[PDB]
């Protein structure tokens, strides 16, 4: 699977490592949420990441299915 990642500069799409067949999006507010919106982490995973309180995590299983909001139709 190819997933979007926020770990690169510029943000980019990457082929996920072996055994990581999901893309994920994890989002939470920081103190600038009211202006910059939520912080978003995008990447690859074997199992859909666990979420702490006030975090949102959603996974998907098709190529490039987890775009950053500013790179999403």
């Amino acid at each position, epitope marked *: 699977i190819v997933c979007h990642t926020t770990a690169t*500069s510029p943000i980019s799409a990457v082929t996920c490592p072996p055994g990581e067949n999901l893309c994920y999006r994890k989002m939470w507010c920081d103190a*600038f949420c009211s202006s910059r*919106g939520k*912080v*978003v982490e995008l990447g690859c995973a074997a199992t859909c990441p666990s979420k702490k309180p006030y975090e949102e995590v959603t996974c998907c299983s098709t190529d490039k299915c987890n775009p950053h909001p500013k790179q999403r139709p």
Partner: antibody
Amino acid sequence: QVQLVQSGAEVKKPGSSVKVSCKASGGTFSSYAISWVRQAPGQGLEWMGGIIPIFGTANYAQKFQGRVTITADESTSTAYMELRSLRSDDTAVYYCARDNLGYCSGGSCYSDYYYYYMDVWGQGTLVTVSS
Amino acid sequence: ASNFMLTQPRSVSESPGKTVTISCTRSSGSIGSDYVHWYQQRPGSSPTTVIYEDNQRPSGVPDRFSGSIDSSSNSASLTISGLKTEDEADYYCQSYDRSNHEVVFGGGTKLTVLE
């Protein structure tokens, strides 16, 4: 203590274009946005737009949409403002300026554009357009 | 389609050692819905920040400079106490219009120190 260093003053004929550059010290734009702000003679500051290289996206003020192009090359740590179809109202000092609040850290990034305060400013570039 | 306006007085004048206040009134929408920052610009120089995020002072900026917000007048204010001749400069407020996704600058205030 990043600095932004801009190209020099230019004098231009009407209808021509100018491309002003803005070189960041330190070899990178990181996750920062760079805006272009201009100041016509004796007048106030006016935002033209900005660019966020880490997202590959630019934002424009409606007043300049389609006539200005703002770009940046991370590999040469240089940002640019190309303003086309120059007219007398474009005589101004043009500044580049860094948004103090980066868009990314620790492998995650903010979701929305929001231009915060401008901490580091270039020295300005005068562009004078004849009548 | 028009951005909101930030309106400042064109000129403010005062003697050294006095306190001066420069206001920045938002024409539409609430002043508290978006941060206000303030820049100083001396002649022939680039702007520098004196107040950001309504009332925060960058390192290096003297404590004589402060910022505040007044919801009832829908305004932000830059206050300079113990005015010094070196404070003569143009001052600009700045905020952001979320509807149009644009930075908004006030029109600028020229501060003159009376002799």
